[PDB]
Amino acid sequence: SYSMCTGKFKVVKEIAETQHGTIVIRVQYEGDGSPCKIPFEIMDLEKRHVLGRLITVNPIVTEKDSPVNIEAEPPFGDSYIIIGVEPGQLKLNWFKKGSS
């Protein structure tokens, strides 16, 4: 029943595609109020619609200076992988090949 992290995140492992077409990322929390839920969302390029899905069940910051693994199923094509609140918010580009 944790609230969202208010601080910032650093990319420790850049987006990599798995053999299942999913993506994995590792981010490390900078700030306080942890344990806290990592704010995570996938959007279209216009930042108007939330897309895809988190595979990681409730990603929580549980350690000081240690990365947290996040796995997600992005939509096909271009999307933004958005992590953390503003002004530190990470905005990562991703392209998933194929169609449904």
Partner 1 sequence: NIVMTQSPTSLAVSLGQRATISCRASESVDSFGKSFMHFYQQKPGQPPKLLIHLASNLESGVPARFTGRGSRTDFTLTIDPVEADDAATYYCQQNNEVPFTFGSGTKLEVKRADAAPTVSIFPPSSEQLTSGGASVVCFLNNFYPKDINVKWKIDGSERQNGVLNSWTDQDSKDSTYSMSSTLTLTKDEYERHNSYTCEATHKTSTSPIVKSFNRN
Partner 2 sequence: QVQLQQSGAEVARPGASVKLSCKASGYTFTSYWLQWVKQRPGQGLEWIGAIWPGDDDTRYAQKFQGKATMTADKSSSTAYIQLSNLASEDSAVYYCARKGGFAMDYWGQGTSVTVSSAKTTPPSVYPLAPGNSMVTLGCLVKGYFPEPVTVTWNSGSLSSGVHTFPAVLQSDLYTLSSSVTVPSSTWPSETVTCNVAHPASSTKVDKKIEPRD
Residues that bind partner 2 (CB under 8 A): 6-8, 30-33, 85-88
Tokens 């700030």, residue located: 31
- The yes or no reply on residue 45 touching partner 1 (CB under 8 A) is no
| Sole window of 58-66, 72-80, 81-89, 92-100 interacting with partner 1 (rule: CB under 8 A) | 81-89
**Residue 69, both tokens:** 């693994």
- For 32, the token pair is 């306080």
- Contacted entry of partner 2, partner 1, none for residue 88, CB cut-off 5 to 8 Å set by kind: partner 2
Instruction: Give me the least distance between CB of 20 and partner 2, in Å please.
Output: 34
Site mask for partner 1 (CB under 8 A), range 47-76, x = bound:
x-----------------------------
Name the nearest CA neighbour of 70 among 41, 45, 36, 34. Answer: 41
Question: Are β-strands 23-30 and 36-37 bridged in parallel, bridged antiparallel, or unpaired?
Answer: unpaired
The angle subtended at Cα 57 by Cα 8 and Cα 97, nearest 5°, is: 85
The closest of 46, 45, 33 to 6, measured between CA atoms, is 33
18 vs 32, which CB is nearer to partner 1? Answer: 32
Rounded least distance, CB 41 to partner 1, Å:
6
Residue type, 59: P
Chain residues binding partner 1 by CB under 8 A are 4, 39-41, 47, 82, 85-87
